[PDB]
Paper text:
All these three CESH[L]s exhibit high sequence identity (>60%) with L-2-haloacid dehalogenases, which are members of the haloacid dehalogenase (HAD)-like superfamily. Studies have shown that both RhCESH[L] and KlCESH[L] adopt a two-step catalytic reaction mechanism by 18O-labeling studies.
Careful analysis of the obtained CESH[L] structures revealed a potential active catalytic triad consisting of D18, H190, and E212, along with the active water molecule in RhCESH[L] while the corresponding possible catalytic triad in KlCESH[L] consists of D48, H221, and E243. In light of this hypothesis, we constructed another inactive mutant, RhCESH[L]-E212Q, which was expected to halt the catalytic reaction at the second step and create an enzyme-substrate ester intermediate. As expected, D18 formed an ester intermediate with the ligand in the structure. The D18/L-TA, E212Q, H190, and the active water were all with unambiguous electron densities. The carboxyl substituent on C2 of the substrate is bound by residue T133 and N134 via hydrogen bonds, as well as a water-mediated hydrogen bond networks; while the cap domain’s Y58 and R59, along with N134 and Y192 from the core domain, bound the carboxyl group on C3 via polar interactions. Interestingly, residue R55 forms a hydrogen bond with the C3 hydroxyl group, and the substitution of R55 with Lys leads to a loss of enzyme activity, along with a significant increase in the Km value. This suggests that R55 should play a critical role in positioning the oxygen of the epoxide, as well as provide a proton to the oxirane oxygen atom to form a hydroxyl that facilitates the epoxide ring-opening reaction. In the structure of RhCESH[L]-E212Q/L-TA, we observed a significant movement of the α2 helix in the cap domain, containing Y58 and R59 that directly interact with the substrate, toward the core domain.
Author numbering:
A (entry chain B): 3 to 246
B (entry chain A): 11 to 246
């Protein structure tokens, strides 16, 4: 008789990237402060950056509602333009600086666990980014965040953002494997819940610093998702991927 | 100057023939002699090549795995007097196109290019095939692009244009890298730079070498590392 074993029958790990793998907030804060210099203080810039992702999320929630896709870089830029208008009394940015500020969403550094965790996961699973960011943006953050993918997948490829099912199912179709063999890895519950809806596995990566050192992150209960980890290496360990 | 290097993969980066030959023989063992299987593999690529040539002409897209499977199924019937294959082995034999081994230069050459360029696969192989070929050929990509992404094979313009749009890089800033002149000529026609990688063994010894003189394309190289060298990428 063959013992049941402990292997998990996932073929691909689909990764949300922003926040889940990348310290976007620290990048955007540092990027903006570097670009804007003495025109913005950290707290004022931090509040804009926090409002920036909220505007991006609000706009992406709105676009998902109407089944619309647009360039997420344009989403980041348009939301920044709106926020610069509300903070216009405090500081200003040129178009060139707005372009440079938007680029920060494409210069995200990864959390220290991610590059080794992604490589550690390679030994058993395909790792593919499934990001709402434009395909170029994720290709770009892959350089700044040292993300080595088997596949870069974007909402752009599917003409639809996560949580829309076509993103996960399309990613499954592209990867040539059933969604039930996809482990979705996100730091955001919406992403995993939708991936669970299409049958994919759910791995929540706790990112306590995602929204800052004092930022508020959802304390996902144990058992909500198939995996609850604070490190991609930790997820890799729980997936039978030995550390190298 | 280029911002991304767009690579054709089958042949250009991968010794698909030796891959498919050894892969088939590993599956079929002594049912089929090496020479007979080698003939099947050569006709197999031919069926794929001819099918894609036609589908390109008709602006039609099909799963390239289906193209490999269907052509293999027809080839298995044609060769069914010499050997047979179960339905499972047809799948396993067709899997060999997703197990392509790279040429010895490609892993180091791709990595050396990474330091100064985005490197992205643009293959006619289905997205799953190139992703799996990345594992077998040890191809680390910034981006994997399949004809499946665009519903159109190379050399169709929307593949290079689609790759440009996806990479966020103007075609003039994309160096197309291919072992086939058709790929680069069309990429040249979208404004992309052209690097021809000579792969004299890609069709085997009997394979005809499509002659490419110096000056036909921007780069004429015998390896990816040589292309990286000609592109200013420091060695490793």
């Amino acid at each position: 008789l063959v013992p049941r074993g402990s292997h998990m029958q996932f073929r691909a790990l689909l990764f949300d990237v922003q926040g889940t793998l990348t310290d976007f907030r620290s990048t955007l804060i540092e990027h903006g402060l570097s670009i804007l210099g003495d025109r913005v203080d950290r707290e004022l810039w931090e509040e804009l950056v926090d409002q920036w992702r909220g505007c991006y999320r609000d706009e992406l929630d709105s676009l998902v509602k109407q089944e619309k896709w647009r360039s997420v870089r344009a989403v980041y830029r348009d939301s920044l333009i709106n926020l610069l208008a509300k903070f216009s009394d405090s500081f200003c940015a040129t178009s060139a600086e707005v372009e440079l500020l938007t680029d920060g969403w494409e210069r995200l550094r990864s959390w220290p666990d991610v590059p080794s965790g992604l490589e550690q996961l390679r030994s058993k699973y395909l790792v593919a980014a499934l990001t709402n960011a434009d395909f170029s943006a994720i290709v770009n953050v892959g350089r700044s965040a040292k993300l080595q993918w088997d596949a870069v997948l974007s909402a752009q490829l599917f003409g639809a953002y996560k949580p829309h099912r076509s993103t996960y199912e399309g990613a499954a179709t592209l990867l040539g494997i059933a969604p039930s063999e996809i482990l979705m890895v996100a730091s955001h519950a919406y992403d995993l819940e939708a991936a669970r809806e299409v049958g994919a596995g759910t791995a929540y990566v706790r990112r306590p610093l995602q929204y800052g050192p004092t930022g508020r992150t959802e304390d996902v209960p144990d058992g909500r998702f198939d995996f609850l980890v604070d490190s991609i290496s930790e997820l890799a360990d729980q997936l039978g991927c030995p550390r190298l």
